[PDB]
Enzyme design. Structure first.
Site, PDB file in Angstrom:
ATOM      1  N   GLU A   1      29.299   6.682  70.683  1.00  0.00           N
ATOM      2  CA  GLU A   1      28.651   5.580  69.969  1.00  0.00           C
ATOM      3  C   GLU A   1      28.457   4.380  70.851  1.00  0.00           C
ATOM      4  O   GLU A   1      29.345   4.030  71.616  1.00  0.00           O
ATOM      5  CB  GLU A   1      29.461   5.153  68.749  1.00  0.00           C
ATOM      6  CG  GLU A   1      28.974   5.739  67.455  1.00  0.00           C
ATOM      7  CD  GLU A   1      29.856   5.377  66.288  1.00  0.00           C
ATOM      8  OE1 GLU A   1      29.989   4.186  65.975  1.00  0.00           O
ATOM      9  OE2 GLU A   1      30.431   6.289  65.682  1.00  0.00           O
TER      10      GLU A   1
ATOM     11  N   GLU B   1      36.856   7.197  64.551  1.00  0.00           N
ATOM     12  CA  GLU B   1      37.522   5.898  64.560  1.00  0.00           C
ATOM     13  C   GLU B   1      38.615   5.812  63.512  1.00  0.00           C
ATOM     14  O   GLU B   1      38.501   5.067  62.554  1.00  0.00           O
ATOM     15  CB  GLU B   1      36.486   4.779  64.333  1.00  0.00           C
ATOM     16  CG  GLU B   1      35.379   4.776  65.349  1.00  0.00           C
ATOM     17  CD  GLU B   1      34.346   3.678  65.166  1.00  0.00           C
ATOM     18  OE1 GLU B   1      33.899   3.396  64.038  1.00  0.00           O
ATOM     19  OE2 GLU B   1      33.907   3.129  66.189  1.00  0.00           O
TER      20      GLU B   1
END
EC number: 3.2.1.23
Lengths: 489, 489, 489, 489
Positions: free
Chosen positions: B387, B206
């Site tokens: 995720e 991320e």
């Protein structure tokens, strides 16, 4: 990790009226309950949900599936009941040498001719279908406790509507000694025909709820719904006797043990200054019934007698437990407080901050330990926790409820109480009497539309305790109160 | 029943900073994050919880236990990351033939001498301990994805406090091209030393959250917390380049695939009249980054260029997904509405009646399908759902969240998207950055006091999907919204 | 600003049983209700709260204080009722030329001798105390509507317990035509003795609730609580007749107008496809009663007759309104949905998101407009909104409830309906029948311990509307739904 | 009934930035606050609501209406403030004989020439419009307290954005001694021009919130938002001095009294074992500031000095109070617990079960008594409760909050504290700084769309206390905690 003896067994409880119907051709319209719930007046007054049993789980036809899922969880004990109205849906010949006007039923003649004569009236199909069912159960390897009575009386023995209207010139269930006589003969006949499949015997299920909700707590919607303290005692007196008689009838045909399943609550004092209130509530609600069928002690009028025909008629005690009851003294009285125990708001929190189920009952595992040790220390009869569960369709509180309660059984056991099994109130969702299908108590969720069963996460937790004979270390945190924070208040 | 290909794998994701520390002698005080969270000013302003990582799960010492429990659930894929500051806790020699004042980093020289020289500086212990860990993982039989960067930069590359104060004459993380240069060399060295254990490669985790929360969303408490739109773009530009370089560095030493893990959200239009707002949000938030590292398209100034040194630097896309974001147009603009997605009240309900987790994020499985199919149709690179999870300590919503999302992966797959795995955000509870230990995202609950792990019922549900490679029929009802009724509003 | 005609009056409604007792020596134990609520069986079944009227507000002794506070708010109309059992607490001589076995009561002989003879039996004290009270009221300057019947029947006319037990050989209230005969004589006697103080006349209060809750909705705890559809119709038939007769009796002694106060609900269709269900519910619940006492239309058996002795026996209609009722068709049927109207959870929100009061009733001002315009367009008789209020001790919803409903009266008026007054259900807190003191409907809070009254903020809002004959501009925002956000769900 | 002295006055408080703008041509873009809230970066980071003051109540143009409504409630005291940037929107000539590098400002030369020279720069319109406003106020008959500073500094004295970025080479508000010098000259000029309308003087409003939230509590969104403990002390030191100077400047032109308005909280100990924590918090948060400007005691470095130029510079203390703060010791430390006081969830309940407002502040009237008696016993200066209120748009808690707090003032008074007035935080809804228009603190609701005012029921309750100089008996029940039951948790 909390371990249980090798002989302690884990399983479930179920009732006929609640789970059997659902599969086509499984209907049984011959009970006071089937009638009570279809009554147009009862529905309009909102006494019954409007939900009909005919659309239940389907255990009459889908029992293999129920037992399959039961095997997978590793359950080793089951407690079902036979439906009286399925055997004898038609009236039996008035049993000679029997005076209805006789208050007491000190005895009943059961002998092989009698049984042989009852066989002429019994419904062979119902009889064969049941045998198949208990057979299938027994093949899987489950210990089987059999309950003779789990509420519904056949119509020919009780028309609930007529009594509700105040008409006592008809079949009046537990108010008539006829019912006591026939129950004893029914018990023996069934024992006589199933003793090869049964392991232990139970005469009736929570007799106190029948007498109590049917004649005093009239808002519950239980039949006949005729409010009278007096008639409530009449039915209770007849129920005690019907037990002793059934006990003797079963003995006449079998050596297997015979006990009774009773509804319990742990009476907690609102304040330290309330200890006496507790003692008085347990007497009024627990001890008087068991002293009757055990020490043979009872009292007609206010006349404390001791009928040896009642003395010693119990082998084991079935303990049903759900929640607590908070009491408070009143000079000589005692009272049941609302906002605690069974009288809580649904899906909210009790006056003590403990969460409450979909039925409005408060989370209180500690009460099981109290109930088990009080029975043990007073009568020393071994026992089974024949019912314990929670209405919770979402399955939010069940994992904690299950593990916390199983933990207290383990705790009672270590205090010396002979408890031999834990039977969860229900494998699958069933019909909750006046409440309908809305109160879901099952480890397995039921799509009443397809009769299909689903595993709720707590089923997988139960499979770990059962399959392991213990509260394993990895799930030991569930032995706690569900977090109230994320839940409604 | 929903089946997944035989090759689809189920597992978990984890990060170093969040799970490693906890066991004595496992401390790593050499990152910008360890510092940021111990800063007295940051604590007093309430930017960081006050919870310290030193008291985490303990994965540095208890990793066997973590992998044991991971095996039991039948997980077959893991995605961990190496902590940069553990290898090189001390400064490396300024890399010659490198002008800091150079905006672009079109290349980095990595060759065996270089690697061999870096080995002189690397922390042998950290290096050996990691090898042991990934070894143990690999023995169990798990496919292993390795992430190079999961937020913390070593202090010698970023002092977050100095930058927070507005002082740019120091190690300034992603604002300096030095960091870009060293990241590429770090990537290659690690690939070079672990390629025998790794299966697939991920450069960073991320990257968009680092650039976004660190320089614009300053209330989140992420370092350096210096509010500036301009500096935010600088860091993003440097991050894109640091990826291309790391990609090339890893290739120099390995043939294994290399992708990136990105934070996603499904942009839903508040009204049908909001379609364009969605398109604009996806560009601004998704497409611009991937068009950069894939089509090589980017723009300095407003000057849309096409740096072939960026072109084609991605093999696979890691998809992280938690919730949705509701947008609404604004003449030319678009906006992010509160009361939906990530901006909801904790343990309550969104403006749309969907329940929300302990972090205030809204339940919206449908958004995963949208994210997966949009990436697939635009770039056709295979992907992993790296995720997906929920902060939920009680475990009320997790069972539904898990099954509902796994169901949408299955749904994307059948629409033709090549998705090869589902990695749940977290095996056990870990440290949630600025939020501390309070946000519990694990299938296993952690008693931070004893470092002991516990199975939450949803772990047993995951073991069924994993161990079966499918959403079995008995748990197929969990593919629904948790009942809001019993939950808080 | 919403203005009302100069002749429109603002005031309150109150009942004898609910507000009178409380002051020492004010007890009246001669009604079916006083008995019903002290019954030990009724309390144990939880049919009645356990709260006793003897400890009420104290309007028998503290009526000056009540009228003082009423003056201060600027109220100009009051509607009280005389308690039948206070006048004639002892049996009256069977009225000759009257055959109990006669179904219909086409007439009653009332003449001055009769009245003069009744005076021999009447309780002079009760009679004088009332005169004092209505005198004091009249001095303050309030228009006075007088209600003859507001539920309790004297014991000699109805023993509720005997009927509850199914014993119909006793005084059986509305089931016996005797009651019809005596009610007509009672009406006339009272009119005859108070006509100098009265302004308008009302025969009875919500007769439909007496017949409905007493014989069908048995869980409400209203006497006699004997469930029977048939007996419910018998009582309703007798009530209609007792009205016509009372109407004629009052006319015999007075020219003042005479109407009836009826319980209403606005029937809303669950879906557009439910219009017919609404029409059917209004017939079944509203129109059949008024077509009877107005067009003289009724039906014994299924035999639609037209008894001219009923024809035209109404001068005005009292409209009571609290909430709505949501209905849905059923092939030929229609149903009342829960989660709306009166069947909502307490202090929560209805299935439509509208807040609910302490009694579980849903906020729906719009229904008043519907009720007022339907009555107006069908019978064109002028009307008073004789009751409208909310159980709300905290006073959170009352300000909005009050202003929103007064606003709809104003709206009905402008649509052409002749509505001449708005009487709020209650000045002070009173005894809510089976619910006890717990449901507080007053603009003034009562400390039942000291009998002291307090002004709830909504009293000060009412004083502005009353004192101004309009919804002034500064409080015009209260004409809205209370914000559900800060309130419980 | 609780009576207050004849001289005790009831009124309101208001600020310029918060209430003035709204009417066309009322804009004032020359403050650090107007800028801070329009900053695109501040909006994107979510530091400011996005609500702009330009669309406020409209007190610059609609002040007659505000005073009309104020008269109707029977209020007799008002405390407004002049906006510094309206007078002097352009820079003033650097004041000679003034060395910026001088830490202390032991004095400022103010004489009539000076004032006369300042008049050359002052904005005549702003000056005349204010005079008109305070004139109109004074005609109605209200005592008038005038506040010199209520947060915004003119841009030429503080550019909040530049400082937020870490650039200290610009106008830096309270960090520069220039600001201290000019504030003193501003105070005197205003006193000099309005002394005929003013009754009492206040230098500044809650100086501690400016220093505290601006430099430490950076998440509040107050300017400049530069996190630094050191700079926070610098600003506080400069604020204390700017007070002493302003005090002396006003004295130079007037005999009227001069005090300061301070933000308070009642520090309650979490446990009996926390008494010392309380004492330490009051020092750190209350006593150090007042010992400075009263006993003249302060400390540069850690060097406890006693600057006689600060000694005795206060005539009265303004007490602002909203809620409590729960503290707990820490060996030598003490801490502020969340879930209590200001750190509670919105519209829910604190950890102690006390309801919370729309801002998340806990209901705790008792804390006012504590604050008032502690100030009284330590410094014996008379005081006014210059602020007390609640964010509550629905008006659910306000009636109880108002009466309960007014009750504690009355209680402090009877304990001997000289308190001369209660000024409610706000007549009408205004702009809540970083929170925007969403937090409604007014007795009157504002339709920001039409600038129209509405009376919330609590306004009518206030009119009773004010118009009566006492908590009358009929509203004395409001002196209690709002019922949490019907409210959200």
């Amino acid at each position: 990790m909390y371990s249980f003896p090798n002989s302690f067994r884990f399983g479930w409880s179920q009732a006929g009226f609640q789970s059997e119907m659902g599969t086509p051709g499984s209907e049984d319209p011959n009970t006071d309950w089937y009638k009570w719930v279809h009554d147009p007046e009862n529905m309009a007054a909102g006494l019954v949900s409007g939900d009909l049993p005919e659309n239940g789980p389907g255990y009459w036809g889908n029992y293999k599936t129920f037992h399959d899922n039961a095997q997978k969880m590793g359950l080793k004990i089951a407690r079902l009941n036979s439906e009286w109205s399925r055997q004898f849906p038609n009236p039996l010949p008035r049993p000679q040498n029997f005076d209805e006007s006789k208050q007491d039923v000190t005895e009943v003649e059961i002998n092989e001719n009698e049984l042989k004569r009852l066989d002429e009236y019994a419904n062979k199909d119902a009889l064969n279908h049941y045998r198949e069912i208990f057979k299938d159960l027994k093949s899987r390897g489950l210990y089987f406790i059999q309950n003779m009575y789990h509420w519904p009386l056949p119509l020919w023995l009780h028309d609930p509507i007529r009594v509700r209207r105040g008409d006592f010139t008809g079949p009046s269930g537990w108010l008539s000694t006829r019912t006591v006589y026939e129950f004893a003969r029914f018990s023996a006949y069934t024992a006589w025909k199933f003793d090869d499949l049964v392991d232990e015997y139970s005469t009736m299920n929570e007799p106190n709820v029948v007498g109590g909700l049917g004649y005093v707590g009239v808002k519950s919607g239980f039949p006949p719904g005729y409010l009278s303290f007096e008639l409530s005692r009449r039915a209770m007196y007849n129920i005690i006797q019907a037990h002793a008689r059934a006990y003797d009838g079963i003995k006449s045909v079998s050596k297997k043990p015979v006990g009774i399943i009773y509804a319990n609550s742990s009476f907690q004092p609102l304040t330290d200054k309330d200890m006496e209130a507790v003692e008085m509530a347990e007497n009024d609600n627990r001890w008087w019934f068991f002293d009757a069928i055990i020490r043979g002690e009872i009292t007609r009028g206010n006349e404390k007698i001791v009928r040896d025909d009642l003395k010693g008629r119990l082998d084991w005690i079935g303990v049903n437990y759900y929640t607590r009851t908070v009491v408070k003294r009143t000079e000589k009285g005692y009272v049941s407080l609302g906002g605690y125990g069974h009288g809580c708001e649904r899906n909210s929190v009790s006056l003590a901050g403990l969460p409450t189920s979909d039925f409005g009952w408060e989370f209180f595992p500690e009460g099981l330990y109290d109930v088990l040790t009080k029975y043990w220390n007073r009568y020393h009869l071994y026992m089974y926790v024949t019912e314990n569960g929670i209405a919770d369709d979402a399955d939010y509180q069940r994992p904690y409820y299950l593990v916390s309660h199983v933990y207290q059984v383990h705790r009672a056991i270590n205090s010396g109480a002979d408890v031999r099994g834990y039977l969860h109130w229900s494998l699958a969702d069933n019909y909750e009497w006046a409440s309908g299908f809305s109160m879901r108590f099952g480890l397995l969720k039921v799509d009443y539309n397809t009769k299909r069963l689903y595993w709720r996460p707590s089923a997988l937790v139960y499979r770990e305790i059962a399959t392991n004979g213990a509260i394993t270390d990895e799930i030991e945190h569930l032995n706690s109160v569900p977090p109230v924070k994320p839940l409604r208040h």
